[PDB]
Amino acid sequence: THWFHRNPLKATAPVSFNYYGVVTGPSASKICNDLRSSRARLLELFTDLSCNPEMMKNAADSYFSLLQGFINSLDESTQESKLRYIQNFKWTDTLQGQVPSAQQDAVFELISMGFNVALWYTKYASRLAGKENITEDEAKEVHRSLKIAAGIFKHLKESHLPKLITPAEKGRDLESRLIEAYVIQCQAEAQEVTIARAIELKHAPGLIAALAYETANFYQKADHTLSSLEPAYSAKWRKYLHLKMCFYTAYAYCYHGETLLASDKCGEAIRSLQEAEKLYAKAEALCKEYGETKGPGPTVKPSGHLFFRKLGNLVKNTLEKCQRENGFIYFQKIPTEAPQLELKANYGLVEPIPFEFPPTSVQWTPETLAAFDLT
């Protein structure tokens, strides 16, 4: 069963979109009511455990198609919307606890809400990934959800962050590096699901070894991305990434050893299996430092060792094959160093699904927009 660390959802101040005098005429007034309601509904859905990706997709597009009117021009004879600065938006952040941040920009709202949707996808994903039975249909769903979240994060980062007038404090979700980390964790996580599938389907060891190794590199890269932050808020997360890295380095060594065995290198294979078991033991160390490290989001546990099942199988086959050469329980002619892994994964690597916001709601007409009078 899967274990994925999760930081808490962002929270936001209620927005009524009630502008009083600024609003003149029924058209502009109804569009403000629909903004109010479509935002409220989307926010309610975040904490709803009966929410699936169909409902979230609908609610999000409804709200975003309206919100877009505060951002993009209609006739496009104007740079942007005149309402972009009308409203102050306040959001908490995944690592920052109860200390919120506020900007009066519609873009900040767009990015923050969109960031929370992606977040919601990773949570729906891990909620499902943690169930026991876990049919194949549910696995695609988890895999797909994680890739959708990736696309949203990536899109927000490249096509949106630059538009902001106010750069976010380092350590906030709207900082570029933080978003890159979320992208990479989403890919790494989707690949975990593919690794479990590859293993139950009994694919080639080299394929699984390459995928495990590439996955550990993503975690290492995500960790390197969060390295530029402050230890107080970012420490727990980074420990989890380091832990994952040990977990999947241990898998790579396990399945590499089967490769070395099939090529009749007994000493090298033995050494490589020893490394797998060592790394996994150190991974069980880092696991406790992780559970004892103060930081945002609850602590998760691996349990569930399918590793020792494979290892026991490799060991018996290796000892039967390699004894009379390297020895029975006391091993001779073993390389002093573990093999240095360079592995290319040709199968299983995950791309984020390209994402785009819906086009501005047709409910935004020049007449409606004109009924907004700022003075």
């Binding site: 695609k140 895999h143 593919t194 599938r197 389907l201 299983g348 690597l349």
Partner: peptide, 17 residues
């Protein structure tokens, strides 16, 4: 679905066998 080398692949990107 096939990859660039013409290998049949599944939903998860693994070789379809």
């Amino acid at each position: 679905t096939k990859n660039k080398d013409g290998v049949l692949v599944d939903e998860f990107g693994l070789p379809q066998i």
